[PDB]
Design a protein around this ligand. Structure first.
Ligand SMILES: CCNCc1cn(C)nn1
Ligand SMILES: [Cl-]
Ligand SMILES: [Mg+2]
Ligand SMILES: [Mg+2]
Ligand SMILES: [Mg+2]
Ligand SMILES: [Mg+2]
Lengths: 194, 194
């Protein structure tokens, strides 16, 4: 019943543009919306985010996260490892690549979401959420070698899965970090389950 | 180590702006970023709230109450937690219970309220509080709940059992063109993984 009529370019950078979207509301009334898009998409989605489950025998299972300075936020954020999918790369392959670059861990694919939206009231940005397990007992994950690209500066933060939400709250309380909403969503459901 | 040097406006809409952000990298080198911000944030501790609404009813499995709306940025229908912006002077908890009632009809009870968490920190400064609310579906207030959508809001309510949320979401994605929100998907995945 609702649909896009036209999109007016307002402003286009190298990485992001702003559009004025005209759409038909269900009553038959034309309306406008200010919409953001990335200029980099081809792809199933803009990006992947990786849920990396680090499994070591006789240890708690951990979720591997990354801490980085995020210029739009003006501060440091705690996030699932993540990056954009390369032209002609699959979401799975992007997940394992990003995970290795950002963490040095080598992982195995467990499952892969459909494209999911990041902030659909503002942008068209989408990602695949990719669950990956990491055999922390294998020699290739003993001393994980992180290969950052140009301009990535990533700290790795592993947190036990069974206390994830309490551990994150503690970091926010002590370290003036912002937690990512998808990380927080996942942590909450771990507590809310059953 | 890293910090913001300057923020130059590139383009300002009614609702959204684009900025050229200059910052210092941890090598001591100046770099830039293209940053999105909303124009509507005043003294709120965040832009908005998203509500995790746990519908509880005697001799029913708990349901997660979700909303389906057309999102102009996305050009299509999206399934999301009930959400909206925090009005000036409004508490995150008040915004949550208000938005929940407006979008679903349900009158909730506060359970917990997150710190401000980032929506897409590689792109925007946008933040929310994630507010968990329980709905006493045995109360007569919540028996045959009617939305009170504001102007240009057109919302369908979808309640899904917590104990099968991921499959039930997958089944809706299989049946029509719609996108699940990444925070919803993350929360459903944790429910499976716990
Ligand atoms: C470090 C390379 N710059 C990437 C980027 C992404 N956006 C939105 N602006 N700059
Ligand atoms: Cl798993
Ligand atoms: Mg990244
Ligand atoms: Mg990366
Ligand atoms: Mg809303
Ligand atoms: Mg609303």
């Amino acid at each position: 019943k609702q649909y896009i009529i036209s999109e007016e370019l307002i402003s286009e950078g190298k990485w992001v543009k702003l559009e004025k979207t005209t759409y038909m509301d269900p009553t038959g009334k034309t309306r406008t919306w200010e919409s953001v898009k990335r200029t980099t998409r081809k792809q199933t989605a803009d990006g992947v985010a990786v849920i990396p489950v680090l499994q070591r025998t006789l240890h708690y299972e951990c979720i591997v996260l990354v801490k980085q300075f995020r210029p739009p936020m003006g501060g440091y954020c705690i996030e699932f490892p993540a990056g954009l999918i390369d032209d002609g790369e699959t979401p799975e392959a992007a997940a394992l690549r990003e995970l290795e670059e950002e963490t040095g861990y080598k992982g195995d694919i467990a499952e892969c979401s459909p494209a999911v939206c990041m902030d659909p009231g503002l942008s068209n940005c989408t990602i695949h959420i990719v669950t990956v397990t990491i055999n922390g007992d294998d020699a290739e994950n003993a001393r994980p070698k992180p290969k950052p690209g140009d301009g990535e500066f990533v700290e790795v933060i592993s947190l036990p899965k069974n206390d994830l939400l309490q551990r994150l709250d503690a970091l926010v309380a002590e370290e003036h970090l912002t937690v990512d909403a998808r990380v927080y969503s996942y942590a909450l459901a771990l507590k809310h389950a059953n």
